[PDB]
Design an enzyme around this catalytic site. Sequence first.
Site, PDB file in Angstrom:
ATOM      1  N   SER A 152      13.308  40.350  70.330  1.00 34.02           N
ATOM      2  CA  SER A 152      12.854  41.745  70.104  1.00 34.02           C
ATOM      3  C   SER A 152      14.108  42.573  69.964  1.00 34.02           C
ATOM      4  O   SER A 152      15.178  42.103  70.366  1.00 34.02           O
ATOM      5  CB  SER A 152      12.122  42.227  71.370  1.00 34.02           C
ATOM      6  OG  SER A 152      11.845  43.649  71.290  1.00 34.02           O
TER       7      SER A 152
ATOM      8  N   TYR B  85       9.981  43.274  79.791  1.00 36.80           N
ATOM      9  CA  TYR B  85      10.026  42.697  78.447  1.00 36.80           C
ATOM     10  C   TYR B  85      11.461  42.575  77.968  1.00 36.80           C
ATOM     11  O   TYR B  85      11.898  41.515  77.437  1.00 36.80           O
ATOM     12  CB  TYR B  85       9.244  43.576  77.436  1.00 36.80           C
ATOM     13  CG  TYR B  85       8.953  42.834  76.126  1.00 36.80           C
ATOM     14  CD1 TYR B  85       8.139  41.721  76.129  1.00 36.80           C
ATOM     15  CD2 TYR B  85       9.497  43.269  74.907  1.00 36.80           C
ATOM     16  CE1 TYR B  85       7.824  41.042  74.949  1.00 36.80           C
ATOM     17  CE2 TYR B  85       9.192  42.611  73.735  1.00 36.80           C
ATOM     18  CZ  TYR B  85       8.362  41.509  73.759  1.00 36.80           C
ATOM     19  OH  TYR B  85       8.062  40.795  72.601  1.00 36.80           O
TER      20      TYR B  85
END
Lengths: 256, 255
Positions: B155, B168
């Site tokens: 990401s 995350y």
Amino acid sequence: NLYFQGMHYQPKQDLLNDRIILVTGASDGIGREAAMTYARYGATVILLGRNEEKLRQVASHINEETGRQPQWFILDLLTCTSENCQQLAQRIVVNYPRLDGVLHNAGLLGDVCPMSEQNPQVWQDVMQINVNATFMLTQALLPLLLKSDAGSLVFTSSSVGRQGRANWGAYAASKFATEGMMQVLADEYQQRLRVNCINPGGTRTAMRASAFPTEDPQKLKTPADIMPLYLWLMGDDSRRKTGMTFDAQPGRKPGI
Amino acid sequence: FQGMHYQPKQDLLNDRIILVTGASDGIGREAAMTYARYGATVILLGRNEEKLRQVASHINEETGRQPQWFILDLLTCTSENCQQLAQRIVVNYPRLDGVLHNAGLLGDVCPMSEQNPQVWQDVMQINVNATFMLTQALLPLLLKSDAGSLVFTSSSVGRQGRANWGAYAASKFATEGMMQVLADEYQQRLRVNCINPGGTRTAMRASAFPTEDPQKLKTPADIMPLYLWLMGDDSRRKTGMTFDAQPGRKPGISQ
Ligand SMILES: [Zn+2]
């Protein structure tokens, strides 16, 4: 990360007067050296660790050197819950009006072996201590740190937290995670806290010897030798530095 | 032209056996369908039997072949479970030519002072620990390929941490690290790389950005060229790298 190179840092002996600094993993190695160094430069130090016997000795040694005896608290990162971290923070709240620094030195190396051989239970322990419990303890201590005029939060990284290398398994994953956590916190606390990592580099410690059993540890710097960066990150000279990862031995090439 | 500018030949993936995790929804679903459309033999992994069957039925309708699926829940799977799974595939397939790790949990999007520690633990367990355990169980099958390709999902917050992305972010940093260790260990034997899909039109994405108009995002279908590139022979010399599917998008919410 080589920023500190050629700094030849020699601060005033009262650099940390009136700074209250919590050090984790304080029983031996780099954590004990950091606690003793910070106290010698005037800090009010709080020791955290899991070994009562060793923590008592470190407190006594500090008292012999400074005339001030630090308190110690037991917290085992591998088993603690969020509630345990909040309960530790509440104890600190009763005894201290703020935290000016938190040095997260606690950690676990785990297996040094190929990914195909890494033990999944050891992997999970390494993640639990180095990432999850380090997060949980940070979260519990944030309100104390925010009461400082300029609180400083420091995590421990590694060269393998910047570039992963064969056989470093969970330790590498956990130190990349640490750099990530550090960056998120630095972003959320811009102009409020300093948040940074230190990579101690190869240092004369038991963890190092376990990873490199053939290395002569006498060729390595000791925890005492690498203290200048640790002092710099807690004192006023680093005031507008955040979001960065620093090498304590910028000169040294990674590896044996 | 490469990576995201890739213009693949039809049947690029003929006779490639590729396992896709989190195959029920979103990107994993699109990747499974796309790999089968370019000729691959796909294996679907996920936790939801009904939804996996539905993806397999769609691939069958499109291509004439029925992919098989296996059930694994990364939140609760033990190392034993991962080994059992590899056993199950091993009865039916001679090698794995690719593994796309697309399963993941986003967790809380909120400041570190508010991150729920049980959610945090869950995000690490799925995205890091179980992803590792599954990789370990599948490595011998990947080594049986002429040139196996192992792909993790990263990401923008796995490269630069940003406020409110907590667990995350930590987990995707850990994913880049795990990819780098694995690429180093398997140089000249496997390719190991990450894909950062960038923001795409999925339910996960809408949950993190409730004000965003999803029609301003690319769909999973739009970002497939890179996913094909990393599984096909045109990426054979590439390992240890993280690739962006949307090199020209500003990270975070759409304008
Ligand atoms: Zn001392």
